[PDB]
Every structure is written in C-alpha cells, then in structure tokens.
Symmetry: D2
Subunit: 396 residues, 4 copies
C-alpha cells in the first residue's frame, strides 16, 4: 500500500483532501508537511528524529510528533540516604546546577548521610458538583461525613482498579457548589488516570443518592493539580516527605566555605523572612524547583507538576555539643511522582529510574518504588539547598 | 601495563584504550577528577564516565538505553551541564496553526503526557475559526531581590528613604547600567523587615531571560550603595524577593519578566461543532472551577485549568529554564458572554510573570534553536532588542489560551 | 492637709478601717514613692469606681494635657463584672453607638440584629439589604462544621522522631489515648479528627473540638495541655515549645482556617426577585452578577487574597461582635467570606446570592458576654448564655445570624457600587 | 388621655406643636396603625434621646423577651455627633472597658496607651511588655511610607483597549493629567505613582495618596471619581464597573497591602538587655528566639499565612482602634505584622526585637474620632485632631504608637509562651 508510493506522492494526497507502515517515516512526512508552512523550512534540519523508538510514544505520550528534544543529563552523587547510596540523574540546561548539587551530596556524605521519612501518600482529584441550593449541598457534605456515606462512596471508588483504596474525603462548600477531594494511593503510578476513573464512578454513585446533583467538572481545581494552592501545602498531595542531616562544623568550613552560624542567618532571612515578604505559599526554599525539575525530566515524570512538587520549607539550626554543627531539613508535603505510566514507559527515562533502582512496579510491595523516588527527590533537594545556600552565605 | 600507560599520557590519552584508562583509575595511579582535562574529545569523556559509573550501580546495565552518541557536547560543556552521562529525548509534537496578531505559528511542545498536543491543537483550530487571537505585552523586566542588613531598623529605613530620592536612585541606576548594554534600571521596590532590607532591582535584558545580567548589575549597584552606607552587610544576592522559582504573590502583583494578556471570541457555532459544548456551559465551569475552585483551594495566581502543561512543553522544546514554570504558569483565565445574543464566547488569559528568552542558557543549543526558528524568534533581534523574547511570550500566552479553551470544553462536555 | 505616710499605712493595715479611712490625696501619696504599686488598687480600695477615679487622677498628672480624660466617661458603670475577668488598669469605658438592622428573615424566623459601629450609613445599608431579603421570601443557612482549634508546636530531637509521633497519632489506638486525655478535662471537650504537619523536627498538632456555647479557647487549651502531657508519656524526648505554634490559627490570616474551618463554618443564601432588585436595590440582576464576579472574585484574586472574596463582611462581623461581647480581634479570621451571585428562576432574571464563611469564631458564654450591656444585645437575638437542652445551639444560631447579616450587607453595598454612587 | 389617631396627626402636622405635644404612647399608637413610617421618627421627634427612647419601646414589643434592652444604656449620651454621621437606627451604646498600658518609651518620649477590650490579662500583659521596653532603653520607630488607597475596576471593550489605557496611564503626560484631576479635589491630595493590573478586559487601578490626618477613604474616593472622569474623556468606551474592585484592598486579607503597603508602613525596634529579659519577662533570649522562629515564622508558614507572622498584633491593634475612634473592621489588614527576634550582644543573651507593619490604616480626624470620649483617648497620646503646621503628623504618630504597643504585646506574650504553664 503506502510502502510502494514515494514521499512526494503521499504528501500530494494529504493536500488534496484525501496508514504508513513504519513510524519513523510518518514522522518524516509530518516534518515535510510542516516545513511547507514555516517561513524558514530549513529550521527543522537540526531538530533530530532518526532512530528513536516512536512505538511507545504514539497513542500514549505525544501527537503530531516531528522529532525529539535532547536535554543533557548529569549525575549528582553519591547521595547517602537512609544507609544507601544513589547516583541521581538530572536533566537540565542550566550550567553549574549539577556541580552545585554534587557538592551538596559530598557535604551530606561527610556528615554521615541523610535520613528521610514519607509522612503521607495519596494522589488526589477535586471535582466540583452543584446542587439547587446551598442547603442541599450542605446535606450532601453531612452525608459524606457519616461512616455509612463514606463507606458506599469508598466501595464505588475501590471497585474500579487494583490499587484504588480511598482515604478520608475532604470537602468545601461555596454556596451551592461542593468541592470533593478524593485521595488514594495508586500502586507505583503517579495515579492521575486511576483516581479520575474512581472519582467518576464514586460521583455517579453519589448521584443516585442525590439525583438533582449536577457534576459540573471532574476537576474543580480543588485537587489541586498543576496550579499553586495552599491545600496541597496543608493537606499534602502524592507523597509528603521529610529529610534531614547534620553537617559537622569542619565539613561546613572546608567543603561549603562558610560557617554554621552564617548559614542559619541566610536561611532564616532569605528562605523564611524573604519568602514571607514576597507573599509566598509553600516557597520557603532557595531552589528546590531546579532539582525537582531536573530529576523529573530525566526520570519520565510530568514536569508540569513541579508547580506543586517543588513546595518546600528548608530549615537550618545550630546543633551538636559546641552548637557549631549545622542541622538541615527539607519538608516537601506534595511530591507528585511515579515509576510506572506516562514518560516512565519510555526506555531512556527507564534508564534513569534503573540507575536509582526504582524503575517500574515493586511487585513485593506495591507503591514502594514511587515512595523511594520521592525520598530521593527530597534528599537531592536538600543537597541542592545545602550547596546553593552555602554559596550565597560565602557571598560571591 | 600500568606505568607504560602513564608515559603515553605525558606526550597522549587519545592513544590509550578504554580499559587501560579505567585500569588506571581503579588501581589508584590517577584520580578520577583529572580525567576531565586529560581525555581530548568530549564524547569519549562521556563514555568513560558512564563505564566508571556503571560498575558502581546495583544493576550495571542501567544506562544501556540512555543515549549519548552523536550529540553536540561542546555547547553543553562548561555552560549548561556537568558530570554528563548522555541526554534525555523528550518527544516534540506540534499544535497549530495558532492565529495570533495576524501571524500564524506552529508551536513546538516537548511533552510525554498523551493527548496534550492534540487537545491544544483543537483549541488552536477553534481560535482560527473564530477570527484569531490578539495579545499585548503589558510589562517587561526581569528581577533580582537581594537582602541586605543594617545594624538597626532605623538605619535600614534611612537606606529605603535614600533609594526613594531622585538623587539616590540616580547614583544606583548609573552603577547598575554600567555593567551591560541592555541594563536599564527601572523604579526600585523595597520592603523592610526589621533591620533587613529587601531591594527588588528590575530591568529589561534585550532578548535574554536575564538572570546573569541583572545579578551583575545588582552586585555593582550594591557596591555603590556600600560606599554611601559602609555598615550595610550584603546577606545574600538573592533574598527570595525576586522571586525566582518559588510561588510568590510579588510576581503575581508586580510582574516578573514579561506580563502578557491574550484574547479571542469564539462564535457559538464553533463552540458546538469544534468544542462539543455551549458558551453558557463553558462560562459556568470557568467561574466555578478557575475562580471559585482555585479560591477554595487557597490559590495565589493559579486561576486557570492547566497553563503549566503548555508553558512546560514549550519551555523544554525552546531551551527555556523549565524550573521557571513555577512562576511562569501564573495565569487567570476569564470567560464571558459576547455578541448580539450573548451566545459567543469571549476568552482571555492574563499571565503577569512569563520568564523567558531567545538567547543564553539552553537556547544556545542547536536542537532547541530549531524550535525557536520554527516560531521565527531564535536569537537576538538586532533592529529591536527584546522583540524576539516578547514574541515568544505572546506565543506562550496564546498557546496557553488555546489549551484553556480545549480542556475547559472537554470538562464542560463531561464523560 | 495630708498626714504623713506612716499614719496612712497603719490605717490601711487595720481591718476595721481600711482604705475607706484615707483621702484621695493620701492614696496618691502612697503610690508616688512606693508601698503601693498601682495594680494593688484593685483589691485594696473600698469600691471599684473609686479605684478607677484614683487611677485617672494619677494618669492625668503624667499627661501633657491634664484635661485629656474630661470626656472619657467612668461613673456609674458596673465594674464588678470587669475587674479580674475582662480588663486591667481600668480608667473608664468607650461608648460605641448601637444601631439595629432588621427584621432579618432567616430560617423562617426574624431577627433584630444589633450593630456597634461609628461608620456612617453602615447600619442603614445593612438594613436595606435585610428588606430586600425579606421581600424575597427569606434567607436559609446551615452550620457545616463546628469546632474551635488550638495549634501547639512540639519538637522531637530529629525529624524522624517527629515523623514517628505523627504516625502514632494517626493510629486508632494512639488517637484514642490522646482523645481520652483531652476529653477528661471538661464535659464539652470532645476531640475530633487530628490534623498534623511536620516542619523538620517541629510537629504542629491541630486539636479541634466543640465547646458548648463558649467560643472555647480556654477549654481547648486546657484539653490540649493534658493531651500533650499524655503524649509525652509515650514520647519522653518531646519538648512542648509553645501551646500555640500559630497552627490554630488565632487572630492572624491563615489558609488553614479557610480550608479546614475554625469555630463555625456557615453557608447562607437567598433568591431576590428581579422586581425587588430594581425597586429596593436600584440595580439589576445582570449588573450585580457582573460586579460580583469582577470585584469579589477576579479583583480579590488580582489582589492576592486568601479568603477575602467578599465586599465588606468585616464591617458586619466587627459591628455585631462589639455589640454582642465577642472578641473583636477575631474579626481577622471570622470575616473570611466568599460571596457568590448568579442568575435564578424561570426568566433567569432573579438574583441568587450566597455567603460562605468557614471560620466564624463566636460564643454566647464567657469573655465580654458576661457583661450585662452586651448580654442585652445577645438577648435581642435569643442567644444569650448557654442552651441547656441543646448545648452549643445559641452559639450556632449566632453564627447563622452573623452570616445572614453579612449576606444582607453584601447585597446592599454591592448594589450601590453597581449603580454608580 | 391618649387621643384618637386623627387628632394626634393634626398636632403632628401643626408646625408650632409637633411630636413634642404628643406622648410616647400616642406616637407609638400612630406607628402601629401605619400613619408614620418607623424611619420618619428621626426627623419628626425633636430630641435625639427621645427618638432613641421610642425606637427602643417599639423594638421591645417585637422581641421574644420584652425586657432584653433593660441593661443596654442610652441616656445622657451625645447623639448630636452620632446621628447623620456615625450610626443609624440607634437604640443606645455599648460600653467597652478602657485600660491603660504604659509608659511606652518610644522615640525618646513616653506614651500612656488606651486599650478598649474585654479579654482578661491583655492590658496587664501589654503593660508588662512596656516595662521591658522602658527598662531596656526604649524603642525606636520609623514611618517608611504613607498613603491610603482605592482600587476601582473599569472595563474596556477588549483586553487590547485595557492594555492601551494601562500604557497611557504609565506615560508621564497621561499620568500628569490624571494627577491634576485627583489633586484638585482636596488640599491633601497628592497622587503617587499609579499601580495597575489587567485581567482580560478588566483594569484595576490603585490610586494612592496622603490624606492629612484623616484615614482618608472619603477623600481618596472623591479624588478617584474625578480622576476616572478625566480618564473617560480620553477613553469614552471605558465603563466604571465599581469605585472599589477589591484592589485597594479595604477590609479583606490581600497580599497587595502586605507588599505595596496601605496607609502607614511602620517599623519598630528595641534591644532588651539580658537582665531585663530575666527579671521582667521571666525567661532567656534563647528561649524567646526559638519560640519566635518556630511559631511566628515557621508556624505561620505551615498554616499558609499572608502577613500573619506575629503572635497577637490584632489584639493590640483592635484595643487601640476601638478606644481611639478608628474603624475597627480595618484591623483585618492593619494587624498585618512580622515579628522578628534576634540574639544581640557578646554572648547572644540580649534580645533584638522588631515588628514591621506595612499597612496600618489609621487617622485622627473624621469618623469615630469626631466623638468626644474617643477624642479623650486621642488626647492622652497628644494626637487628637489635625496638626496645623505639619499635616499628617498626628496620624503618623498614632501609627508609630500602634506598632510600638504591638511590639510590647509581642514581647510579653512570647515570653509567657516560652515559660510553660
Ligand atoms: C547554578 C547554581 C545553582 C547557582 C549558583 S552556584 O552554583 O552556587 N555558583 C555559581 C556562580 C556563578 C556561576 C556563573 N558561571 O554564572 C554559576 C554558579 C549561584 C550563585 C551562588 C552564590 C553566588 F555568590 C553567586 C552565584 C546561583 C545564583 C543564585 C542567586 C543569584 F542571585 C545569582 C546566582 N545559581 C543559580 C541558582 C538559580 O537558578 C536559583 C536562584 O535564583 C534561586 C534564588 O536563590 O533566589
Ligand atoms: C491530556 C489532556 C489535557 C486532558 C484531557 S482531554 O484532552 O480533554 N481529553 C482526554 C481524554 C482522555 C485521555 C486519555 N487517553 O487518558 C486524554 C485526554 C482531559 C479530559 C477532560 C474531560 C474529560 F471528560 C476527560 C478527559 C484531562 C483530564 C482533566 C481532569 C481530569 F480529572 C481527568 C482528565 N486531561 C489532562 C489534564 C491534566 O494534565 C491537567 C488537569 O489535572 C488540570 C485540572 O483540570 O485540574
Ligand atoms: C458605609 C457604607 C457601607 C458604604 C456605602 S453605601 O452604603 O452604599 N452608601 C453610603 C452613602 C454615603 C456615605 C457618606 N460618606 O456619607 C457613605 C456610604 C458605600 C457606597 C458604595 C457605592 C456607592 F456608589 C456609594 C456609596 C461605601 C463605599 C464603598 C466603596 C467606596 F470606594 C466608597 C464608599 N460604604 C463604605 C464601605 C466600606 O466600609 C467598605 C468598602 O471600602 C469595601 C470595598 O468595597 O472595597
Ligand atoms: C490574653 C493574654 C495576652 C494571653 C496570655 S497571658 O496574658 O500572657 N497569660 C495569661 C492569660 C490569661 C490567664 C487566665 N486568667 O486564665 C492567665 C495567664 C496567654 C498565655 C500565655 C502563656 C501561658 F502559659 C498562659 C497564657 C494567652 C494564651 C495564648 C495562647 C494560648 F494557646 C493560650 C493562652 N493569652 C491570649 C492571647 C490570645 O488572645 C491570642 C493567641 O491565641 C494568639 C496565638 O498565640 O496564637
């Protein structure tokens, strides 16, 4: 069929208001079609496309594909975290970011490593529904807060998927609007599609108890996904994580080129007081977003979720016998992450997840790989904070 | 032989083999950090670093499918990335044409979320069938917000009053502007918190995003301030008052980088046929999702559906700092009735802090430049400095609006 | 005339005599040059009003205008209920005018709502909004949640230890132990779901419970202190850093109050016929909706507001609070409100309106509600004091009336801005 | 003796008789028989107190307990300065106990600060903070900015047009034309650089200007209306949607007040020697810094606060505001405060403290400051009325006192939380 025709002939068919056997050739024909629309048709020539595995992308990750975009990958490590060592991949185009993070890892190792805990775990979706009156929506809130009501909604939610196990609901009324925050774990997936599916069946079960309920939108911005929101900061979303380390005064002096006292002064007055004066919600850190974004791109995460995933408070205190050692912690309540699905289905992204030993599903304990990646992100963010803050204090 | 290989390094490394250099590191004849300068070519440096790293992994075959061959590392080395072990391919799709200010754009989008490019593309189609979109740049100026301390709050108050005078500001403006061609300091904004003083330097940067340039002007400006106030301590060149890569109301209210607005009217027929909904249904969902819903969630600047998706995809494709998506995604999406019988859809997005550039950083790499060239905005604009970066910002805000139209229509339609 | 300090001290020390056997001038002598500090005037002097008078005379000599206090009243006020309970170093009182806005038609009842204010037109404006609601068939409200909070911060030696305490508090058995300790301190102490947050080795714990008709801060703090003492038995290394760590959050703006609620969360609503909107409010439904979206939603958004999606709910909350003996400083969070307006009815021309106020901090027992004048304003609404057969009902009713009067005030001010002066 | 309705009305309409020649019961008989509307009472009745008296009697019959107003006082209060200026439908007045905390040692002066509250121990606590400041060598404050705002919303046909008006307002000649219009409305009107923001075809314009010693909403709104009238000449398609689009922002929480300021921006400071922290405040500098960081910075941060980085600034602000005739609803934003605490001296045992309050909304002329008891409390501080030779100094001085009393409050409460108990 299509293999017998030439390139010029197939394009003659597309323009004349009228499939291909190989994926790479389809990408080439789309480049040639697109070339005819651009003022500089030669602009595509250094946008690569050859010898990429497009089979895992089509009908899954991207449409109208004209190639790919190489992002340089560097390694910050070893990062000593919970008695293990990690070579952390970081996809960035910002010079010195990997080298800065790498120095932070070095300081943590010489202080006996970092320790981390996951505090909560559950992806969310926050639909908006409407009832005729605010009194009716008040009735639905009261019903959802009974043990009986939650149990039928939990049963509906949990019937849609293996890992769909519903946790406590959170709700808000705004007049006759009702926002309902469904939270659940999702194995090792980030869990978006899984929770929306459970939400749809849970909402249709709610509709049987309340036939006059309109489902306005499956997302009413109460999740909250990919926008800044105090609800992710206060309630969490995905993995809530804490990480810490104590850096000996010697190691702060020799590696970090500053003092424990000077680090505390900059952290308080930049990360707390400065972020406060700027009107920040959840942005009490130096540059967590650099690290999160770099790891996310390299590891097949949804990079748009750095909006909320970068939420972080970095604290720095005096520590030890002479009060000269630096205690550091980062607390990140809303790390949105996964080791299956999305961009983690592609081979290059999996290579970076394999480096960290978290690629794919953890079969013995569903969800444990994604949990480990969240811990790795929090630890690497703390390395980034340690290093950049030291540079800022030393005052270059 | 080990000491035979060291004698060849005295002449070179190019003559040796992979296993011999790795033998020289494992036995401690030579430390690993010296391999940067010794090996001549960049691609072989990446290869050795991969082999050395792989033995330390618990699964030594992890890097098999991470590509590294036949990529331009010369532009990346010493300017974009360190400890390089390869590159990460992110698929690029195209949404267009986007009909924006009498021009048509094919918008590159680096993403791995299925149906994002297709959804965005449908929004473009609805905009085009509704007579195009229009956009305006409202403000332009990258910021840096250092923190200084004085001995007392009374002294810091004195410095604030001095910076607010005509003569004080002029002396600070001259030191700032002496560092670069495009360095042109606009009115300072300051906040005191006790003996702390946070100073927000704002300025255009031509077509660069402008982080490095504003920081050079900031350091020289603070140096002149030090002569007028010797007791002043420069605590940190960034005091989170900029604010860069963290959510902050100051970016939402004062702006950062390019502030941009965009708009269009979608005819009622186009809303039914292309978007599978009505104007009345779109409006109801926008009010209660993007305003009231974001309000109930405690949002500052997150009055949109998924601006972040579009901002992030364009940013990766176009060599932007993708971490700046945090602030650059700030967006309010408004929808309302238009036309004779209130049946057409007026839509607008306003994005006050798009941080962006067409020169410097990742826009110096050729693949990223190709996507910039697709849009006709690659590199500097000699005649009108800053016009390429202003145009990309308008493209981002317009593409975001296309994305808001499409997703909001799907949410209003249900199922 | 005033005899020396020695004779003045012996007469004060004598039980048969006391401060009654001294002149004003002699008491001012023993203060000027120690022996009596100033705060001891409370317990020592014969009557409360004389103690106030003496304090005023002392104060007037320190001032640069000695006649400053001339028009600050103090005589004949009932200071018995104020000393040792509501105020110290008392030098008089401040009269705040009290107007009435009503009848407010709320839940098939009517309410004459007291409002203490000095802003001109506020009471008449709110009264106009009440009339519009009345001609629209009345307003309906519901209490959505109920629980005053307190948000202490503790510290463990490590964040891993603070993480251990968070997880233990989340087990059913762990919460049960802490709930038992909390609930034993008072008959109204009934601990609800706990919310916690970690910041490194800090752990913020939000204790929440109903509190009868009292606003309930004293009671929650006493329950909180016993709960933390018990938590220390299981975690001896835990340090209580502060009984409030600003996680409550009390008297400061905070997203947590907006999202979780504090005290009473309340929604109120009403449909105003298109006829009434024209005649009474001098505007149209179409115009009110447009002003509400673009002022109270879009405008507040551009201003970077958390919970301030309203026109002037703080005016009504503050006025009712001062009149009804509430803690007026809690206006900060109690004014949190989102006002929504949309089309309604067959024509699509009638104005639907709702106010949602997640964090009304309110009580009809304790504090300023012990004073008789502000008890009079509470009695107007039928919510004075405790409700025996149904504890908490007077405080719940007062929260409904606040949210209903706010909606009336929103109706009226929004109509005025819509019509153009 | 009570006459028929028709006879009572001929006396009412008789110009040389009126209501004076009728009894209370006759006027009430006329009201219940629908001959005089209840609102017409104000103008018909000769004496203000008698109007209040009769309004109270009417109100009482409607209440479910007729004696509920017995303890709400009304007699012998100066309603002349309240009717048609500060309050309507007036049924009396609400006395708030006034206490005094001082001396507050501020800028080498001493202040006796009046505090109207019903919360036990607030005045004593605040007074202890004053003592620590006085023995600590005093506090120093500075006014960093000054200018009340109004933030109207206007609408252009398209977003492109609103961008056109925005860029027009930013040119020096366009701004100069609007500034002459604004400044022409009052002698204090001095329009500062305009701050604007676009949301689609909306345009929020933030007019700022000093206002003498008045708080200044009447003045700023009057200047704003003439300003937008001039703007409409240049842009006739522009629609003034509301004179307030919540971009001011008045009486709602908003990041814009925190960042740009509104009213008086003020910083206050002091160094408390270790000895004084020990003997007055019963604690150490180290314990206080640890509580301050983890409560007022970190705790407020975890709660998601905008501008609420303090312990109880709102307590002090509210008490002073009620006592001094301010708009107490403006404590929502006026209470905005960040409290910082540092180690000072050779061994880190002295306590540097500062409070920064960017948006104190205050005034010594107009509003409740026209009333005489309120004026007495202003006279205590030497800030009553207008300053002749230096306009705005009295309002500025009151804002520095408010920030210093807040700092005293912060000192005391934080010491108590650092102790235990
Ligand atoms: C890339 C690393 C991560 C980096 C560093 S660094 O790695 O430590 N040091 C340098 C120094 C010079 C270069 C160069 N050749 O231009 C590169 C790296 C610094 C920095 C630190 C202390 C200094 F004295 C000077 C520079 C800065 C940096 C921070 C705030 C500035 F104002 C200005 C530069 N950044 C970027 C952080 C950036 O992406 C988020 C910040 O904007 C977040 C914030 O702190 O607000
Ligand atoms: C990818 C596009 C952009 C997309 C779409 S879409 O383009 O319109 N349609 C589809 C349908 C099916 C697939 C598939 N095969 O998985 C992919 C796209 C939808 C959507 C909308 C209405 C619907 F009835 C069904 C699906 C959703 C979507 C939104 C909220 C949900 F709860 C659940 C799915 N998303 C993701 C948006 C996501 O990245 C930000 C949102 O989380 C932001 C927000 O609205 O809060
Ligand atoms: C007191 C009432 C409550 C009041 C009113 S009112 O009830 O409608 N009428 C009058 C009539 C005459 C006087 C007088 N001075 O003699 C005072 C009020 C108005 C107002 C509003 C729109 C108009 F077209 C005309 C007047 C305003 C008011 C609002 C925004 C202004 F810019 C300017 C005046 N206010 C104050 C509201 C104030 O306490 C919170 C608002 O500032 C909150 C906000 O909307 O941002
Ligand atoms: C009124 C004063 C100002 C007051 C004080 S106080 O004046 O210093 N001490 C008092 C007060 C009263 C009595 C009494 N008779 O029972 C006894 C001692 C205290 C307090 C502090 C440390 C303590 F060990 C005991 C009490 C508290 C207080 C704060 C947070 C608590 F959790 C619990 C009590 N408050 C209330 C502050 C309140 O209006 C805003 C705070 O809630 C703001 C905040 O910190 O979040």
């Amino acid at each position: 069929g299509a293999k017998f025709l030439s390139d010029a002939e197939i394009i003659q068919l597309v323009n004349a208001k009228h499939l291909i056997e190989t994926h790479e050739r389809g990408v080439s024909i789309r480049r040639q079609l697109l070339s005819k629309k651009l003022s500089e048709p030669s602009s595509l020539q250094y946008l690569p496309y050859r010898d990429y595995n497009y089979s895992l992308v089509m009908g899954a990750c991207c449409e109208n594909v004209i190639g790919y975009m190489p992002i340089p990958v560097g390694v910050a490590g070893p990062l000593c975290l919970d008695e293990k060592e990690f070579q952390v991949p970081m996809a960035t185009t910002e010079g010195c970011l990997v080298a800065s993070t790498n120095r932070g890892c070095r300081a943590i190792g010489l202080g006996g490593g970092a320790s981390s805990r996951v505090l909560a775990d559950g992806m969310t979706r926050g639909p908006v529904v409407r009832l005729p009156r605010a009194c009716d929506s008040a009735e639905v809130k009261a019903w959802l807060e009974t043990s009986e009501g939650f149990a039928v909604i939990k049963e509906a939610f949990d019937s849609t998927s293996r890992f769909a196990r519903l946790q406590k609901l959170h709700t808000s009324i705004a007049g006759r609007n009702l926002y309902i925050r469904f939270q659940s774990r999702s194995g090792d997936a980030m869990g978006m599609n899984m929770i929306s599916k459970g939400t749809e069946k849970a909402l249709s079960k709610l509709h049987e108890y309340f036939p006059e309920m309109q489902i306005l939108a499956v997302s009413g911005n109460y999740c909250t996904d990919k926008k800044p929101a105090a609800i992710n900061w206060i309630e969490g979303r995905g993995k809530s994580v804490v990480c810490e380390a104590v850096i000996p005064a010697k190691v702060v002096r020799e590696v970090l080129k500053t003092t424990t006292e000077a680090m505390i002064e900059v952290n308080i007055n930049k990360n707390l007081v400065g972020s406060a004066m700027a009107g920040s919600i959840g942005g009490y850190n130096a540059h967590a977003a650099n690290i999160v974004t770099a790891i996310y791109i390299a590891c097949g995460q949804d990079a748009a979720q750095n909006v909320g995933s970068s939420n972080c408070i970095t604290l720095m205190e005096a520590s030890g016998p002479t009060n000269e050692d630096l205690y550091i912690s980062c607390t990140m309540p809303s790390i949105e992450i996964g080791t299956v699905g999305g961009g983690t289905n592609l081979l290059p992204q999996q290579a970076c997840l394999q480096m960290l030993g978290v690629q794919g599903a953890c079969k013995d304990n569903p969800g444990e790989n994604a949990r480990q990646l969240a811990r790795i992100v929090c630890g690497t963010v703390m390395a980034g904070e340690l290093s950049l803050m030291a540079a800022l204090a030393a005052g270059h």
